[PDB]
Symmetry: D3
Subunit: 287 residues, 6 copies
């Protein structure tokens, strides 16, 4: 009975993957605070090696970009040091390791979109911590790992989405007359449900390498808010604003847009589509 | 006898913007002198000062320029002579006869910084010879006619209609009308559009008020040519594919910035001036003149 | 003494620097006009030229400005109107009157280059809208009053307290006096301090001589806000903690450079002009007025 | 009998190396369409591991810089993914792996010349694809690989040279009134025949690490055209032009010039010389 | 007895370490020009493997930053090629390897300070040679190495200190009327004696990873000269000058200051303190 | 009454040639001296020049020691900026046509290989900045009655007065030196002082105005110049290319300060420069 060990299983993407794995023959182990804690990297190696998993899905991370900037030690411990121990454990167990990374490894060059050939050059501590986390993974598990870079993640549905999409929908449904959205920072959206489907396919094929997974289109939060407004027949105003209006601890690049040049050779794989279409399917689940 | 009419002297009177202006001026009290090759030629800057000063215009609208960005990169001498040296003579002539001078400039004075949008407080840093030539032309205007000039920076100009538009919009429309199976449009270079007809209306207002200083005149929105092609496609019920491509598939001589988008922080204080609107609405009105 | 009654017109007369200058001018024989909102308002630049030309002053001290750096980044229209457009009208008025114009500028015109300090030969390259607005204001002043203006760039200003110090130094002193026992101060932002009292002394001297050009006026030393906070603490017998933090801990609207330190290469040839000294000494003198 | 497996064996350099290995005791396998294709990296590992070579010479690559920029997927599949599978196979077999890379891994910094201590920072997709290829070779074959970075390759002679030097000579022998050459893009030349001689030596020594192999000098195509013109007593005009007069899909750096700080250590290795001397020797093969 | 092999044992740091190891149970082998020469990297692997050390302390390097810029071949051979051979030998023997690196791997970005998450981007050939040296250590000794980045090293005392601090003290004692010190290049100081104490602790814990070890504070040579002046009651003038006054072959960044986000988690390890307390203790050893 | 030409830096290398060329004219030439004008005392310039009432001002005096300017920016400022500003204000008052000799050093910060008159100055050091701000002073005060000429690496003096790069290379060759070292990784353009003198005389008579780059065609290194001189003088020793790092200096130097002109061709009858090798050979011929 093939074993899968999952970190961040109660996270948004993790919950989808954990649920999808229930109708399979895998023995799934969802780590908890008492068995695996990113703040205690020294206890990770012994735990994972004793479990002897065949597959490791490493989704746990410190994703508060601003907290990472104020407390780079936390970004480092949680995203770099803990990942290194997981990578060393994976290598010792001979386990295939999936590492969820981020479009934030890019931004420093200042161009509009980055593909798998672009050399990462981060703009903040979150991105740096994820980048060194990737290095740890590909050095320890060279021919047996998969690194997936996601953009701005959308997922959770009405009951669990407390991120951008859920917030914009909340404001519309509460009868707000004007909603402000940043128009001078660009990125790409990644549907968590879609990514989940891809991951299930990747586990079964034991796909390896580095891949960018995001809907096509380089857009702003303002563009996204406007699209949501159209879908819900919003009557108020969506106001485009500059970043300066909402000061934040971490610098954000002009764009963290990502596209893939390698997704198309994955013949049977579940793939993303156009951002508006993928956003519309997700927004539809709010009824 | 009746009083002498105020005189307007226009360069580039048969260009996209110039044609709208010359036409709108027919319904005014102004006497309009539309320069031609036989009176004013940008390639003969040395004859400009004598010609303009003898005409003694009250207003000078300087729209003529070498606007082929790629030609300017291959032949910077042409860019310099046409956009800088000629403009210097026009500004000196404006100063000498006391004329209010309007200089049409470009969002291409920006780009080297690499940000998404620029307002009138941003300091120009061009990316190519066309932009450099326009920027130094601006300096010539400011230095000579300090308290009596208006510099307007326009972005990607749309205008001309079915008969005259052979720029981006006209070409996309021609491909749609020809039933092209697919149209490619660059997705990784951004800018702002400027409706020539709206700019014309603003210019008529500006001449009447003698507004001075530097302004950015463009529709709201920082978009790509791909975004524009998609919007035109929707307006004309195009059923072929509109394909986003990177700038590498269409090699060009002149470097283009990631963005030359422009916005204004000063247009709102001109309470009764005709203003641009949202890019999609302004584009829709223009595309409507084709069908 | 002087057979004619000469006039000084001051903007920002109640500000930190302005209040010292105004008090100092009471001893002189100049007719001093201290503008107020009813006669000159930066938000109404269109009324400035006629007002100043009617006063026909011999000297104009232009200290008024929108100096909230973060507000300027959020509302660049306000920075533009108050610091650029209003200044342009003042400069045109000074030129019309033959008045010597003193313009207070800022170390914030620098920062984009990323080096540790800047002198008068360094070419301004700002990092935010406040800095751009002051720089463009400087251009207005030079292009209008070339052989009859003085631009002084000041760094982080100290002075006027406890009643008028509302800047960085005043805020640290205020927290200590309020009984705070733990004060955070940014260790990754470097700059130079300028004593307002001292700068006032220099200005009185500059008015008399009608000194012209561009000059940096700041105490010697490029230091961090943390270094300054520790120095203030010592001077005030503070026994609590001064905690050094990174700029990420205090998110702000406007980007700030690694350093806006300024030094002067021209102050030393100004023989008997009052000059600044070492930052710690100048800070001590000022704190010595509180105690 | 030691087995050598060569990719790109029918390319210009590959053909020289294949030919030079004929009078050796090696069993040489030159891959073909029926056994290995850069377009199908998914079939490489099984094939190479089944052959169990002792040495792998990886010369095949997508070298059309402009095509790489328009189609980064092709640059990535051919130069990155294929190279990764070749490196994994070499590691599995315990084979010494030679990877031919490029000066184009540099250029982003904008300086005039780069040595082996300079950190690669590419300017275009071709350069990025070669660099990521080098990383695959280093993450898989530590202590058993040789990465050679070549500059502007010259080779082929009057029958096979259709690159810059061949075209200049063609225009000169056709009696053209003028020749235009870009003067504001700099680089270094690498003699293919010299590089081949060095490679034979490296195979025999199983030399390892990263090395820059190019004639000494950072020069423009204009400099090169002018040099060829003197050698052939050309009487037309050689006109220097800016790169802007020839628009291309891929950006090029102000310089991709490379020099070596480690070549002189290899006492007995065949080495390049000065660019003008190396170019004169190559141009001489077109006379007769 | 476990065997410790040391390169650069007669250097500033090497001498403090060599002496501190005499009061321990290790068999210490101090390499010298007859057994290991950085200029002869070809002889290193055979010698180290024959010795079979359990621990390797690699402190030897070409540290003349300006010489490195003029002769990058020397920088490469001594700091990269030799380090590559030492790393391969360490892997072959299963030896824990400690590599002394430098703050000079940073500087190209132009910011005021760098922590362990910052991606190295050197400004000169010395820095590049040290960085490529670090890469060799990581690629070869995956999970069994410690890389310590030090700043401006202070140590040696009255008889051996001929570096920055020593020179300032000499000018003070000679009664110079004025001392010039560069005010526009910043960095961080590292007390050699303290670093020695940390190294002894690291050897015994076999601590691994990459760590920055320097006193707290980003300062200039001028700040340091002023602090020494105060400590020695110097009556002359300490003049802040721009770096142009002292032309040097190697470019120096605006700052090479380093700080650590990981030192704090090492509970019982000997730590550095504030730059003035640490400088004062060292200056105290001159009188 | 004769038209008056007032010259600063008249005893300098370029200034001395212009002064001699003007002896064969109807101009009343006034060469400034310590008793009338000093760059160190800008405060005394305006009263002097306005009392003198020149019709033409040739402003050649400057602090050109680039490294000294970096160590002592106050000197660079006073001499090149403040003095120039006072001269510009005096020219404006007198209605005099003002010639200001500037430098390619106003460029370099961008890091490209060559700069024309449309490129926006962005200097690399204090010397460059001081010259640039001096230029602004000249434009802002004499808009329609000034000429700013930017020269590159100046060559001139001959066997008696040349103690700069060319002169030093020639002394080493005639002395039979074993080797000569020259920097290969810093580029620029050469300007013939004699050709510039001829151009200046033409410009004075035409009262030509604006900004113009005056230099021989070609972006080259000191090493290229040294090698060309060696060929001309049949030198048989070694000419070794070295990196700029072997000669540390106070002022940063750009990868290139090369300048070219896009406006020199429209000045039909003006004396112009030619190719760098031709212009160099002619200069080198004055030493034989
Ligand atoms: O040119 C630098 C480099 O590419 O070559 C030497 C190798 O050891 C690599 O680590 C390094 O990145
Ligand atoms: O044949 C030489 C050359 O300079 O001619 C002009 C262009 O075709 C260039 O690509 C080419 O290298
Ligand atoms: O004589 C020429 C030269 O290359 O010699 C060595 C150094 O003195 C250089 O400054 C100088 O230009
Ligand atoms: Cl168009």
């Amino acid at each position: 009975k093939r074993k899968i060990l999952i970190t961040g299983g109660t996270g948004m993407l993790g919950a989808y993957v954990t649920s999808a794995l229930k109708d399979t023959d895998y023995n799934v182990i969802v780590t908890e605070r008492n068995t695996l804690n990113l703040s205690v990297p020294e206890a990770i190696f012994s735990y994972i090696t004793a479990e002897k998993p065949d597959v490791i899905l490493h989704f746990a991370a410190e994703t508060d970009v601003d907290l990472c900037e104020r407390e780079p030690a936390r970004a480092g411990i949680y995203n770099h040091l803990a990942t290194e121990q997981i990578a060393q454990a994976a290598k010792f167990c001979g386990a295939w390791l999936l590492y969820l990374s981020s479009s934030n490894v890019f931004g420093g060059e200042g161009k509009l979109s980055y593909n798998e050939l672009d050399i990462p050059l981060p703009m903040n501590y979150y991105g740096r911590s994820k980048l060194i986390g990737e290095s740890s993974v590909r050095n320890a598990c060279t021919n047996n790992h998969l690194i997936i870079r996601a953009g701005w993640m959308i997922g959770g549905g009405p009951d669990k989405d407390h991120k951008f999409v859920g917030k914009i929908i909340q404001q519309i449904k509460a009868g707000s007359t004007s909603i402000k959205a940043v128009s001078d920072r660009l990125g790409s959206i990644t549907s968590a449900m879609q990514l989940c489907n891809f991951i299930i396919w990747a586990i079964n094929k034991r796909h390896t390498g580095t891949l960018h997974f995001a809907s096509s289109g380089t857009i702003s939060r303002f563009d996204i808010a406007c699209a949501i407004g159209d879908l819900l027949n919003f009557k108020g105003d969506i106001i485009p604003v500059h970043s300066s209006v909402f000061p934040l601890s971490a610098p954000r690049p002009y764009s963290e847009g990502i596209e893939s040049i390698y997704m198309s050779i994955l013949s049977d794989a579940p793939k993303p589509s156009l951002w508006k279409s993928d956003l519309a399917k997700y927004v539809g689940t709010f009824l």
